[PDB]
């Protein structure tokens, strides 16, 4: 037999996360931009959730990059924007969603390279 629960789902008190890393963090929900150095698009398929960047300082002994932020490396993957937003909401994280950027469909024509009267005519091949 089932019960009825109309509460908004919230699990902040049973995740073990310190309050500082629930209430002062800002989660960012986005589809990563394509690395402009490459033409492949396979890394722009899934939604991601990262947290606000925090201080890094130089270790006095070695000069290594030290941190006190336990979420500095936390990156989560989601199939849809709704899945990511739902996950942030039940975990109590304040979040920002940025709409997916889709390359606009283009009109390509190899023949335009040799136009009789238009500026699209190329001067070299």
């Amino acid at each position: 037999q089932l019960i009825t629960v109309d509460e908004k789902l919230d699990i902040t008190t049973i995740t073990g996360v310190p309050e500082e890393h629930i209430k002062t963090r800002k989660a960012r929900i986005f589809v990563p931009a394509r690395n402009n150095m490459q033409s492949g698009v396979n890394n722009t398929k899934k939604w991601k959730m990262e947290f606000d960047t925090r201080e890094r300082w130089e270790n006095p002994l070695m000069g290594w990059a030290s941190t006190a932020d336990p979420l500095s490396n936390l990156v989560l993957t989601f199939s849809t924007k709704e899945d990511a937003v739902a996950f942030a909401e039940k975990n109590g994280w304040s979040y920002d969603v940025e709409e997916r950027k889709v390359p606009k469909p283009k009109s390509k024509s190899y023949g335009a390279n040799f136009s009789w009267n238009k500026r699209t005519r190329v001067s070299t091949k």
């Binding site: 130089e58 002994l61 070695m62 000069g63």
Partner: protein, 48 residues
């Protein structure tokens, strides 16, 4: 090495050193890179 001597290179230590830990010749680590961020030096005159 009396029959198969090692190849000679000009940079190989001519004098072997044993473990120097706990002596004044012990290794001490440090960062080998230079300063990253250069600070602004205020003018040395009271033109203000």
């Amino acid at each position: 090495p009396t029959v198969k001597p090692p190849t000679a290179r000009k940079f190989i230590w001519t004098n072997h050193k044993f473990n120097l830990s706990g002596t004044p010749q012990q290794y001490v680590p440090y960062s080998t890179t230079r300063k990253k961020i250069q600070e602004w030096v205020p003018p040395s005159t009271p033109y203000k």
